[PDB]
Amino acid sequence: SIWIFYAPNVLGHPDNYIPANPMSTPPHIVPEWYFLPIYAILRSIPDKA
Amino acid sequence: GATVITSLASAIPVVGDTIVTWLWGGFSVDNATLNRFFSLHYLLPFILV
Amino acid sequence: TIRNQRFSLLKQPISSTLNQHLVDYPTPSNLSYWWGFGSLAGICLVIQIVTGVFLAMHYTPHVDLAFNSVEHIMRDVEGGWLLRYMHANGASMFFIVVYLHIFRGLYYASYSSPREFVWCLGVVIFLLMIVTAFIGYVLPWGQMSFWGATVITSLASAIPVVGDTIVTWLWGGFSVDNATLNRFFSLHYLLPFILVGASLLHLAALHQYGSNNPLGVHSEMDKIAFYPYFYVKDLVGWVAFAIFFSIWIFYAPNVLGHPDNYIPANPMSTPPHIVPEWYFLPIYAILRSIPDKAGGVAAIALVFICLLALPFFKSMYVRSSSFRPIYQGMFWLLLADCLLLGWIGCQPVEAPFVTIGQISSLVFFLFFAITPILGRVGRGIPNSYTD
Amino acid sequence: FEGFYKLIMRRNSVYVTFIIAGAFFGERAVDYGVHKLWERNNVGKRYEDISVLGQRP
Amino acid sequence: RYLEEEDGPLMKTIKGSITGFGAGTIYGTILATWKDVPRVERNVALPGLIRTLKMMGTHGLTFAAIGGVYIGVEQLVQNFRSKRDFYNGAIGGFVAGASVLGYRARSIPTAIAAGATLAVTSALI
Amino acid sequence: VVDPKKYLEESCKPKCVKPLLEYQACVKRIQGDDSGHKHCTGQYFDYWQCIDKCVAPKLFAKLK
Amino acid sequence: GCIPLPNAGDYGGWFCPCHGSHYDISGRIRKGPAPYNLEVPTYSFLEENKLLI
Amino acid sequence: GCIPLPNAGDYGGWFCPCHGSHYDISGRIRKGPAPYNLEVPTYSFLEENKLLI
Amino acid sequence: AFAYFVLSGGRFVYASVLRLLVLKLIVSMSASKDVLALASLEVDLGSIEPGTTVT
Amino acid sequence: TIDIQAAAGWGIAAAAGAIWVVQPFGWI
Amino acid sequence: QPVKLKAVVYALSPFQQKIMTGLWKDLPEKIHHKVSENWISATLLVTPVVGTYWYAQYFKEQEKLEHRF
Amino acid sequence: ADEAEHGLECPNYPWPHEGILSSYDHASIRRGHQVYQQVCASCHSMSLISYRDLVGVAYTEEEAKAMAAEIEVVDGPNDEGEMFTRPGKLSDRLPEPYSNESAARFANGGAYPPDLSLVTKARHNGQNYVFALLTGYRDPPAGISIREGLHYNPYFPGGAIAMPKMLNDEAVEYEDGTPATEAQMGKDVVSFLSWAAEPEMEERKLMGFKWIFLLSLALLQAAYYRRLKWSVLKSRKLVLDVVN
Ligand SMILES: COC1=C(OC)C(=O)C(C/C=C(\C)CC/C=C(/C)CC/C=C(\C)CC/C=C(\C)CC/C=C(\C)CC/C=C(\C)CCC=C(C)C)=C(C)C1=O
Ligand code: HEM
Ligand code: HEM
Ligand code: HEM
Ligand SMILES: COC1=C(OC)C(=O)C(C/C=C(\C)CC/C=C(/C)CC/C=C(\C)CC/C=C(\C)CCC=C(C)C)=C(C)C1=O
Ligand SMILES: COC1=C(OC)C(=O)C(C/C=C(\C)CC/C=C(\C)CC/C=C(\C)CC/C=C(/C)CCC=C(C)C)=C(C)C1=O
Incomplete structure (x- = not known):
């Protein structure tokens, strides 16, 4: 309830409130916070494969 | 966010590009991708149950 | 035995539940092919779920895009016509198979003790099937879809005080519009999964006592494992059903439908002929047989009241119609009456179909009122028919 | 049929490859034959049989 | 030369079965009357009448089956193939002959002979 | 040149004499107005239904 | 909720194809399950040919 | 598949904000996980002030 | 031996049917004909000032 | 010494199946 | 609860029997059985459907001819 | 009233695409498409059909390209923010005769010419219905009058259709040299329409x-x-x- 009624948008990012633009690209593209640890493991290896 | 993860398949050398475009339903993230993500988003939670 | 070592993998805890309920479950050896329609209905349910999931990847539930997304499935996506025709004619195959299944249980009195709960779960499944197929037929958003959704939501108006507020809550507005379509799509995705759970409970009730048999007698002295004996018997039916399904899919994919649903929905003009899909016509006929709004809706509910109360009538102790000449005769009259009701629902409301519809509705209800009389009277058969 | 049994049915792995090969080759043989019947039953009605094909002004 | 009718394949089959039953009843009556009565039956009347009626019914049934199946298969040939000739019909005569008269005679060569004869007879027309 | 269907519709008239003569008699029986509600639509349909059933299985041969 | 077809029925008014409702020229229900006449909304004239609903 | 940011990175070229790929003036990657350089399409010059792709 | 030969004939068809139905669902997710119909065109452009880029 | 033969015979079955489901004759 | 049975059962291997020829064995007697047991049941299913259908066509034809001037 | 209300029932014609191994007559599709773009297209839409749909069915790739370039398709906005016009491409749908349904009704006496992309699937016995309707214009029966602006057609339910007779003899000229009678064009345009409903x-x-x-x-x-x-x-x- 504390998240729903008083901090409903702090767990997300404001950039999702802008309609999708295939042309421009957000300077800070991140996933939801619960995918961040996997996403940091992917970023550390300097090779796509 | 969708443009990256649906591109994770390209790391496969032989069929990587083929899997990405079959995943996308085209050549870019568009309505075919959003329509198929919605159907899978309805079905996966019942598998999760 | 002491299970120190590991025997057959089927009896390990990894597969024991699957083994005892699908591989080794004892089945009466004299089951006929009429017992293969439960697995056929299970396959039809899987066919509906699989094709619908893939169709939902191309369908847009919006009154401005719904009709064209179905046309885009048939014209643009590879194999889209097949997914569409396998789903639209699959619902028909789902109802043919389940109707044959129901009349099998009516002929052999499979609803009687100890299998009352099995019949009751089946009646609920029939209700779930009707709602699921009806709201799905609205999704293409053609002329039949729009006017079909208009009357069945309007059915709630038969309740005097809160009827109008239920109808409008169902619509999401003062008319059938995008709010109705969008919520019908969501419910159409959810309900088939509830159907899966209901059929699993239906099967578990059946395994409490085992299946009935064409003789209707105690069958524990002659039972065989389901696999392979009834697996290969079901496999004959599965291939036969596939040939039957394929004829409809490839050579007549539109005979079990009305051309009016190829016209985009027009809220201003009703079509001159407005009817549901064929599997709903017998209910349609009973509905219009009553010249009263509340009377018609009450009759529709009484159809499912009578089905639910059937296993609880105090009956004679003989199940199968093969030993019940009077009940056997009444079953075939009920079957003919049910075919007649479906044909009447396909006709315009005028003479002589009103009189024929009213008599057909009465005879249908006479089947359920007379059956408890039959068992009650036939209780005295053994004391009267002596050696 | 026992000579055939000794080469293919003795091991399931071979007998499985036999069913995969027959699925492949059987499907191709029916594909060709159904198409040949369709060509023979529809002489002159094809797109390559349009006389003025390629000549639209 | 043939422009006096209203047709209807199902009506055609029904009327043909009905005519077949009538002709078979007449034929069975004639055959029953031609025969003498068994010697154990000369002094009692009722079993002779029963045998006559049984012969009437059996012959009506077999003739109705022929007269129905013949035209039924004739139309089901000329409906699907949708070509009008004497060929459409040679098949109906054959199938009627074979099926009914081989079920009756219990012989396959007799079925083939009966179908062939009916085929030629319907071919001439 | 000349419409195959129209020629065939005139050449099939002998097959449909009975619906024709019944339509012709209906026309006579309604020549008086009677406030303009009598008509011969039913007999009209029977005649042309018979004519159409005669012309249909021979028209598509004259067409390429 | 269906729309009654005009110039149809047993009374020269409207006939609803869905369940067989017959409305007279005045829109009153005469035959069929329908329990009420067709609803009259508020309306008025302006001079002779402008009708406001 | 992300879109690199112009005038960014430590090579004066392009910087991908997604997983830190760095490109130079000639659209070549110098560090990061991207295997290849920026693809060159088929362009020409019809006049001094005219491109085509 | 005769039985196993007769059973393998039907086993050809079951595998063929299973393959066909799986590939139908897989390829239905591939690019549609309208999507493939918008994958080739030419666009022309002009000139821009030094040190700047245009997307 | 059969497990190596069963492995080799099931690899052939796997290879035939792969060439059968995906039929990459245009790509070879 | 298990039953307690006493019986002798002899069985022959499936690979020692003809599998299909029994489908067309004594075919005429099979048809005879099917029509003999079931002709009452077939009449109670076919007569109401055909009878009611025939009356409806008979009704519609006459009603169509009364409205014809 | 009684019989006119549903209309007159159409016959059963032997369409060349009828039969379990029967295909469309592709020459009749191309011919029937010329009838559409020369007679039908001025009032009826075919919004489900693209120019690429005809490639490999009735027209070649070049033929269908030159066909689409002949028409003017709206597009934009440009970089200045206005809507412009461009030649059609193969991905473009067949063009609409009117701007919306109300414009269609205003041009046709208040009646809407329906979209013909699915009309043979959208009517009972549809292929035979369309042929019989187009070739079935004739004089009404005795005692039946038709309101000015309407034409009698017994195959239309009610018998009064806002469509005028459009398949007059030699209304089109064919590219192959087939006599374009009413019955010939009626056959060809239904072959085209049937393929359009079920490609x-x-x-x-x-x-x-x-x-x-x-x-x-x-x-x-x-x-x-x-x-x-x-x-x-x-x-x-x-x-x-x-x-x-
Ligand atoms: C900056 O950039 C990045 C982001 O952006 C902001 C991110 O947000 C993230 C975080 C994201 C993740 C951790 C998710 C990635 C992981 C997975 C598994 C992806 C989730 C998977 C998918 C999207 C794939 C979906 C799968 C399908 C479409 C499969 C389709 C197939 C189906 C449904 C069935 C197949 C069919 C058959 C076998 C045929 C027969 C079927 C029958 C049913 C009969 C990262 C790392 C990132 O760097
Ligand atoms: C999706 C719908 C259904 C599924 C999947 C299903 C499945 C099954 C299965 C697998 C069986 C056992 C095997 C068989 O007898 O065929 C069975 C039995 C039975 N079903 Fe259902 N069924 C469905 C609908 C219904 C309905 C609608 C009814 C009744 C209104 C019903 C009543 C029964 C009865 C009484 C039996 C026991 C029959 C006997 O033992 O003789 N079922 N069902
Ligand atoms: C979760 C599984 C299911 C999903 C996702 C699903 C989804 C859909 C979708 C997207 C459509 C619209 C596309 C079309 O018109 O063909 C549709 C139509 C339809 N569905 Fe389903 N469906 C499912 C299961 C079922 C079941 C179980 C039934 C039968 C009881 C059913 C009956 C229908 C019917 C009758 C139509 C209309 C067919 C037509 O006229 O075109 N569906 N469904
Ligand atoms: C060969 C050319 C044409 C063909 C094949 C064609 C086809 C059709 C079809 C199939 C219908 C449907 C009738 C029904 O709903 O049962 C129709 C109706 C109609 N057409 Fe066309 N059409 C053609 C040309 C035209 C033209 C040139 C016009 C206007 C000048 C026109 C105006 C209309 C109108 C107004 C209707 C509706 C009439 C009514 O519902 O009362 N059509 N047409
Ligand atoms: C011309 O007329 C007619 C039609 O037209 C063509 C028809 O087709 C039918 C066919 C309909 C039949 C047989 C009955 C359908 C039965 C039911 C119960 C459908 C009602 C359910 C609906 C609309 C959706 C359910 C919604 C719910 C539960 C709300 C969700 C809310 C929450 C979960 C909180 C009939 C009878 C008819 O006469
Ligand atoms: C003696 O015993 C048996 C029977 O006699 C009563 C049978 O009639 C049948 C054949 C029929 C069956 C099993 C009908 C069951 C069907 C249902 C519940 C509907 C469709 C089934 C689904 C969706 C599968 C649900 C089950 C599971 C575990 C979910 C996961 C599965 C998948 C994702 C595919 C079998 C196998 C059987 O053994």
Whole structure:
């Protein structure tokens, strides 16, 4: 309830409130916070494969 | 966010590009991708149950 | 035995539940092919779920895009016509198979003790099937879809005080519009999964006592494992059903439908002929047989009241119609009456179909009122028919 | 049929490859034959049989 | 030369079965009357009448089956193939002959002979 | 040149004499107005239904 | 909720194809399950040919 | 598949904000996980002030 | 031996049917004909000032 | 010494199946 | 609860029997059985459907001819 | 009233695409498409059909390209923010005659010319209906008058259609040299319309024949398999003590 009624948008990012633009690209593209640890493991290896 | 993860398949050398475009339903993230993500988003939670 | 070592993998805890309920479950050896329609209905349910999931990847539930997304499935996506025709004619195959299944249980009195709960779960499944197929037929958003959704939501108006507020809550507005379509799509995705759970409970009730048999007698002295004996018997039916399904899919994919649903929905003009899909016509006929709004809706509910109360009538102790000449005769009259009701629902409301519809509705209800009389009277058969 | 049994049915792995090969080759043989019947039953009605094909002004 | 009718394949089959039953009843009556009565039956009347009626019914049934199946298969040939000739019909005569008269005679060569004869007879027309 | 269907519709008239003569008699029986509600639509349909059933299985041969 | 077809029925008014409702020229229900006449909304004239609903 | 940011990175070229790929003036990657350089399409010059792709 | 030969004939068809139905669902997710119909065109452009880029 | 033969015979079955489901004759 | 049975059962291997020829064995007697047991049941299913259908066509034809001037 | 209300029932014509191994007559599709773009297209839309749909069916790739370039398609906005015009491409749908349904009704006496992309699937007995309607304009029966602006057609329900007779003789000129009579154009335009409603029919029919034949073979094997497994049970000899 504390998240729903008083901090409903702090767990997300404001950039999702802008309609999708295939042309421009957000300077800070991140996933939801619960995918961040996997996403940091992917970023550390300097090779796509 | 969708443009990256649906591109994770390209790391496969032989069929990587083929899997990405079959995943996308085209050549870019568009309505075919959003329509198929919605159907899978309805079905996966019942598998999760 | 002491299970120190590991025997057959089927009896390990990894597969024991699957083994005892699908591989080794004892089945009466004299089951006929009429017992293969439960697995056929299970396959039809899987066919509906699989094709619908893939169709939902191309369908847009919006009154401005719904009709064209179905046309885009048939014209643009590879194999889209097949997914569409396998789903639209699959619902028909789902109802043919389940109707044959129901009349099998009516002929052999499979609803009687100890299998009352099995019949009751089946009646609920029939209700779930009707709602699921009806709201799905609205999704293409053609002329039949729009006017079909208009009357069945309007059915709630038969309740005097809160009827109008239920109808409008169902619509999401003062008319059938995008709010109705969008919520019908969501419910159409959810309900088939509830159907899966209901059929699993239906099967578990059946395994409490085992299946009935064409003789209707105690069958524990002659039972065989389901696999392979009834697996290969079901496999004959599965291939036969596939040939039957394929004829409809490839050579007549539109005979079990009305051309009016190829016209985009027009809220201003009703079509001159407005009817549901064929599997709903017998209910349609009973509905219009009553010249009263509340009377018609009450009759529709009484159809499912009578089905639910059937296993609880105090009956004679003989199940199968093969030993019940009077009940056997009444079953075939009920079957003919049910075919007649479906044909009447396909006709315009005028003479002589009103009189024929009213008599057909009465005879249908006479089947359920007379059956408890039959068992009650036939209780005295053994004391009267002596050696 | 026992000579055939000794080469293919003795091991399931071979007998499985036999069913995969027959699925492949059987499907191709029916594909060709159904198409040949369709060509023979529809002489002159094809797109390559349009006389003025390629000549639209 | 043939422009006096209203047709209807199902009506055609029904009327043909009905005519077949009538002709078979007449034929069975004639055959029953031609025969003498068994010697154990000369002094009692009722079993002779029963045998006559049984012969009437059996012959009506077999003739109705022929007269129905013949035209039924004739139309089901000329409906699907949708070509009008004497060929459409040679098949109906054959199938009627074979099926009914081989079920009756219990012989396959007799079925083939009966179908062939009916085929030629319907071919001439 | 000349419409195959129209020629065939005139050449099939002998097959449909009975619906024709019944339509012709209906026309006579309604020549008086009677406030303009009598008509011969039913007999009209029977005649042309018979004519159409005669012309249909021979028209598509004259067409390429 | 269906729309009654005009110039149809047993009374020269409207006939609803869905369940067989017959409305007279005045829109009153005469035959069929329908329990009420067709609803009259508020309306008025302006001079002779402008009708406001 | 992300879109690199112009005038960014430590090579004066392009910087991908997604997983830190760095490109130079000639659209070549110098560090990061991207295997290849920026693809060159088929362009020409019809006049001094005219491109085509 | 005769039985196993007769059973393998039907086993050809079951595998063929299973393959066909799986590939139908897989390829239905591939690019549609309208999507493939918008994958080739030419666009022309002009000139821009030094040190700047245009997307 | 059969497990190596069963492995080799099931690899052939796997290879035939792969060439059968995906039929990459245009790509070879 | 298990039953307690006493019986002798002899069985022959499936690979020692003809599998299909029994489908067309004594075919005429099979048809005879099917029509003999079931002709009452077939009449109670076919007569109401055909009878009611025939009356409806008979009704519609006459009603169509009364409205014809 | 009674019989006019549904209309006159259409006959059964032998369409060349009827039959379990029958395809469309592609020459009649191309001919029937010229009838559409010269007679029908001024008032009827075919919004489901693209110019690429005809490639490999009636027209070549170049023919369909030159066809689409002949028409003016709106597009934009440009970089200045206005809507412009461009030649059609193969991806473009067949053009609409009117701007919306109300414009269509205003041009046609208040009646809407329906979209013809699915009309043979959107009517009962649709292919025969469309042919019989187009060739079925004639004089009304005695005692039946038709409101000015309407034309009598017994195949239309009610008998009064806002469509005028459009298939007058030589209304089109064919590219191959076929006499364009009313009945010839009526045949060709229905072949075109039937293909437009069901462009998948040829692939559908080749699939149906192939698999029904194969599934029939599996049914024979399924029966043998079932009988092989059950034979040990069906031929067993059971001995029991009981008599009555
Ligand atoms: C900056 O950039 C990045 C982001 O952006 C902001 C991110 O947000 C993230 C975080 C994201 C993740 C951790 C999710 C990635 C992981 C997975 C598994 C992806 C989730 C998977 C998918 C999207 C794939 C979806 C799968 C399908 C479409 C499969 C389709 C197939 C189906 C449904 C069935 C197949 C069919 C058959 C076998 C045929 C027969 C079927 C029958 C049913 C009969 C990262 C790392 C990132 O760097
Ligand atoms: C999706 C719908 C259904 C599924 C999947 C299903 C499944 C099954 C299965 C697998 C069986 C056992 C095997 C068989 O007898 O065929 C069975 C038995 C039975 N079903 Fe259902 N069924 C469905 C609908 C219904 C309905 C609608 C009814 C009744 C209104 C019903 C009543 C029964 C009864 C009484 C039996 C026991 C029959 C006997 O033992 O003789 N079922 N069902
Ligand atoms: C979760 C599984 C299911 C999903 C996702 C689903 C989804 C859909 C979708 C997207 C459509 C619209 C596309 C079309 O018109 O063909 C549709 C139509 C339809 N569905 Fe389903 N469906 C499912 C299960 C079922 C079941 C179980 C039934 C039967 C009881 C059913 C009956 C129908 C019917 C009758 C139509 C209309 C077919 C037509 O006229 O075109 N569906 N469904
Ligand atoms: C060969 C050319 C044409 C063909 C094949 C064609 C086809 C059709 C079809 C199939 C219908 C449907 C009738 C129904 O709903 O049962 C129709 C109706 C109609 N057409 Fe066309 N059409 C053609 C040309 C035209 C033209 C040139 C016009 C206007 C100048 C026109 C105006 C209309 C109108 C107003 C209707 C509706 C009439 C009514 O519902 O009362 N059509 N047409
Ligand atoms: C011309 O007329 C007619 C039609 O037209 C063509 C028809 O087709 C039918 C066919 C309909 C039949 C047989 C009955 C359908 C039965 C039911 C119960 C459908 C009602 C359910 C609906 C609309 C959706 C359910 C919604 C819910 C539960 C709300 C969800 C809310 C929450 C979960 C909180 C009939 C009878 C008819 O006469
Ligand atoms: C003696 O015993 C048996 C029977 O006699 C009563 C049978 O009639 C049948 C054949 C029929 C069955 C099993 C009908 C069951 C069907 C249902 C519940 C509907 C469709 C089934 C689904 C969706 C599968 C649900 C089950 C699970 C575990 C979910 C996961 C599965 C998948 C994702 C595919 C079998 C196998 C059987 O053994």
